[PDB]
Design a protein around this nucleic acid. Sequence first.
RNA 1: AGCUAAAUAUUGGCGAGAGACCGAUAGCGAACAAGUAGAGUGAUCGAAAGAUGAAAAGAACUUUGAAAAGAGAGUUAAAUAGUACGUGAAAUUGCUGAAAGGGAAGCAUUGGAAAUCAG
RNA 2: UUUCAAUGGCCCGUCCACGGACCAAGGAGUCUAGCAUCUAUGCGAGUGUUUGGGUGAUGAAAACCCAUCCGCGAAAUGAAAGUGAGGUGGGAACGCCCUUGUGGCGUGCACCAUCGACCGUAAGAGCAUAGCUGUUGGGACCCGAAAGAUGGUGAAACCAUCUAGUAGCUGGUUCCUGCCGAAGUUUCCCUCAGGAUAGCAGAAACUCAGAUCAGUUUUAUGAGUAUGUAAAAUGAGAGUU
RNA 3: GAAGCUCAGACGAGUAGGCAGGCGUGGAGGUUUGUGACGAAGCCUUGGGCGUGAGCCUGGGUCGAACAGCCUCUAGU
RNA 4: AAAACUUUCAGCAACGGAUCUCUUGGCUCUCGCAUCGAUGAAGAACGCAGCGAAAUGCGAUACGUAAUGUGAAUUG
Lengths: 125, 70, 120, 48, 52, 130, 94, 117
Amino acid sequence: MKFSRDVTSSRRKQRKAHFGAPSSVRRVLMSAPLSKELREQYKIRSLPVRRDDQITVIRGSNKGREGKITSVYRKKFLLLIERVTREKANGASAPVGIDASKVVITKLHLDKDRKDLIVRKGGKV
Amino acid sequence: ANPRQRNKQRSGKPRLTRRNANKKAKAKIYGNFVIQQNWDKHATLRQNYARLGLLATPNYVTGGVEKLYP
Amino acid sequence: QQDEVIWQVVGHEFCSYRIKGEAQNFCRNEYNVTGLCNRQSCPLANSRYATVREDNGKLYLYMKTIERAHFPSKLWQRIKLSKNYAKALEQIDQQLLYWPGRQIHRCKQRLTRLTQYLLK
Amino acid sequence: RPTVSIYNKDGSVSSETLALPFVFKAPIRPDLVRSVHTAVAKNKRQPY
Amino acid sequence: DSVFGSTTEVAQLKKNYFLPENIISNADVTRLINSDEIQSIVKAAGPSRVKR
Amino acid sequence: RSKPASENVYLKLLVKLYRFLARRTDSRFNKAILKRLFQSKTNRPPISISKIAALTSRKTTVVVGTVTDDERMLTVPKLSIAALRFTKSARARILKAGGEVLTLDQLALRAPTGSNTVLVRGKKHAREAY
Amino acid sequence: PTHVSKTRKLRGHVWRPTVNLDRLWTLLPNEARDKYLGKNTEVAPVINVLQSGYGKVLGKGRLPETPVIVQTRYVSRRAEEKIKQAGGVVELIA
Amino acid sequence: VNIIKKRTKPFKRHQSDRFKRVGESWRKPRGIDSCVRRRFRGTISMPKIGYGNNKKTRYCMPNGLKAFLVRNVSDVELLLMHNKTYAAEIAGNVSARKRVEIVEKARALGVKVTNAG
RNA sequence: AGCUAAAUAUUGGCGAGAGACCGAUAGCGAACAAGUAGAGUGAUCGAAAGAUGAAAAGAACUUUGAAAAGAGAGUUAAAUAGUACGUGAAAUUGCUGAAAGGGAAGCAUUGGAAAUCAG
RNA sequence: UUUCAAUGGCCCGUCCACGGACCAAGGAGUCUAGCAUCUAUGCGAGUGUUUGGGUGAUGAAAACCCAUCCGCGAAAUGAAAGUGAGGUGGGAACGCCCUUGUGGCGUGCACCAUCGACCGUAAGAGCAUAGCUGUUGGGACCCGAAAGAUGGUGAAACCAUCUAGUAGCUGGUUCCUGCCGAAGUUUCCCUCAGGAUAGCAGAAACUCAGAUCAGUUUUAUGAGUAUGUAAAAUGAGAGUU
RNA sequence: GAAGCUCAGACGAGUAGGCAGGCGUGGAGGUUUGUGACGAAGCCUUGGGCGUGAGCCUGGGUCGAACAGCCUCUAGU
RNA sequence: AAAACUUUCAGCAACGGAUCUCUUGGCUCUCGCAUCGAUGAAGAACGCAGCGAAAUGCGAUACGUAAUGUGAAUUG
């Protein structure tokens, strides 16, 4: 139970906040879990997604597929992963977006900006 | 409803969200260091004064008292 | 306090075992003997009773007393019957001879349809 | 006055016992309790 | 014992409060009907559902 | 009136007990008591302890209704009263100073036919403006 | 209760407060009644009728015969002699 | 005892036929010259208490069983006592998986199901 | 001649947290590009309009047509979801089948004929 | 279900007239303050915590606890100073008999009376809450009238307010079944419209098992075939505030 | 189901008004180990059943995400 | 007694947009706080994006600049 008067448990205000989130806040709502071998040797449970990270789709009609993210399409809360696509009628290939909570991360894109965060969130590297 | 509040409803500028509310805004004690150490950040002021042996008021209490045990 | 004041609370209108229908009402409680909201049937309402139920091709009878009526863990005393149908009828009625025998009919009736269910 | 057993964390009945308080012999009025609770359950409403 | 009190002794944690005394002494009417002190005096019972 | 107007479950027990006695004995006491259990609160006015003391010295006393207390009078006689309700002060005065208090279920155990019982009533005036 | 209304079944059819001597002995604590009433003691009680909410004592009722001192702002002419045979005196407040 | 129904045809509100805005449901007329309220010749018949059916054969289907609405199998277990006088009727929103559980259970308990299909 | 905290008021301002409230003819006039389209010389006045789908995957291509479009296909769990897009009532209309109709119809009771259902 | 035949059936609401082309949605005795009655609950010579204070960590606008006051009641009466309180009859229930019982005998609550006294008192009955209903005031069941007032904009008119202005009146007012069921008129008062008392219709509380009543007739008349009056037939349980 | 059960007899128009018992509506507390993508709610139907009635339940069709019985509270019913 | 026409019944289609479910909106209550302007405010008009007319933002430094924060986008 939220014992605080600081946070709102209104449904109305929680949906407005989710759908009025700026990119610098949508970037957190687009987190993904870490796979088991990543999770245990970094001691961290999840991470916000980043381009070039290697993920495998857990849930959906594209279950079990892997690939590299091309662009975290933040406006519509979607992830476009390479070599997963849907075929249009005319013959073009328009990739469909998977949600950041339906995919797990098996390989990271380590950078000095990310390395500080990992040890920041109680981790080890 | 007012044009003024319709402005920032149809605007794109984020609000000035100010995070202030605290349930049980029991103000913590400054002033005397002795009392500030031996204050109870949960119990009420009239309990704390009587716990320390300090008369909260010299005048009669215009209501009930607290009787927890017979 | 006693069986009648409890009756006018659990029994008459509100229980967790009552089913009011088009013109009447049933009594869902497992330990019932007629399935109806009646004093001679409702245990929540009344003291010591006896009724039977069915488990996995087998029958069991439940009994209670008055000194123990305040301790719900061991309040009901169960007896398992897995021998035969006509034996079950005799195993039940024999144990209720020292007991008021108005509801032996309902008890004996229940075993029959429980037995019929096992056949069907 | 009757006694009631006191139960340990494991579930074993402890040796101590307490006597049943007189309040448990109070009258049971399902007509009164509803009349009070009907009004008391009204005392947190917000106006509209 | 002090939160509620007794029917004849005031509660300690509520002032001048005594428990409500029961309207009726014994709550067993069906035993009152079927007790000797009434069954000895009651006149002979009529029949049950009566023949047409 | 075929049933009391009160949802008091304990009252329906008294009526149930005294509906049995009304039709199963010739005791005109029982019929009178059963009828008075049906009457409303306005028709069951209170009687006082003192008034009862006067009426006994002017046998169990029976009054359907309440028995209040009279503070004006000081030393209470020994009495045996049976009423629907007792005020706390009246009950202490009857019990401590002398006799004992009863109830209509106990009174049926004592005198099912009402033998040796006086059926008193309280002044039915209420306000009576004019 | 708009469910039980009549419109529901009509859808479809168009400063001197007074005290008396009988109540006088009750103003004193119940404890000291049991040790001043009916006992012959030299000390008499004091019933400060002022400090209970009355300014006058009236003559209704009979008197237990224990001499008692009664403090009043006012007293009836037939109140004060009734306590005289009771052995007590009226003490008038300034 | 058999069944006799004192009337089969339903009661239709007056002029319900003439108007689509007037429902086909009975409302008692209140006019003071209403031939329907004054029960003239060849007018529609107003419901009375006289039409009420026999008490021993009321709420009974033409096979002499009172319809008890059943939502799950634990309701059919209640009709265990009354298989000879109550007919179990499946609720209209019970899914296909539960429905066969109820029908099979009722068949085992010997309780007729009105809409077993 | 003078000053002065607090307790007190607060349909506006800056924010919050709620609700036995309303649920798109409701609730603010405005859930939407609303004090907007619009009207009046002017002061003033002032609306209607929410919902494809999990994702546009918004219908490739052929064919008929100048075009609009249609017909095949194809997308989808579903096109009885095709943007005139959730559900899709009644009035109202078109066709099909059945029936009756000579200056009324509608209804009621009782039965036949045909249709249909049960036990 | 549809059609057919036999018999029947004036179009609904409203007050001829007014309303009604058809359909869907919306749409009218509501909230609130005071008072009155009734029923229920709590307490009872008391009663009422919620102006406040205490307290509440978990939904903290809730629940829970309480000090002093205060409201109503506990005493009236006078304009005001001032003062300031039974026995007889019945009669509910019980006991009691003779031997059932009847009847007698006691006992007598309520209340009714007579017959008594005290200044209205006579051995206090209220207080709070909730519900129902009635009524008064708030927009006041819904809609609807001709003016006016303020402040403006044009050149008296116009505009937004007051404003949901004013109703003695017009129109509408939403579900079912059951029970009971009138008067349609005297009486008076009454400038005015009305107000009445009574009757009819009901709901509660209490007497006699009655010779108590009767839209009835007799008996006896008295007076002028009729008239009124009082005193057996027949039916009915009749009563009362 | 003492609010029950049973026997008996009489009576049935009904405006103004008087009186009791029920049907449906939105929300609240409780309850039903309640119903539901194996199809909730709605909607439709020359399908069936129940009630004197307001109304209710159901088969089939259509449909796509929530709903209801019971005890009580409340009303913009 | 044929067809049409008229009417009723059923099926399908049209029209229409009710019902249901939803809902970044309303309304109502409570809470906290005090901050416009001659240093040019409120309001008005013009104007700016690679492609914008509305709305938003913004002012010829024009859908922004500096600073700090986050740490890889924006999206038609």
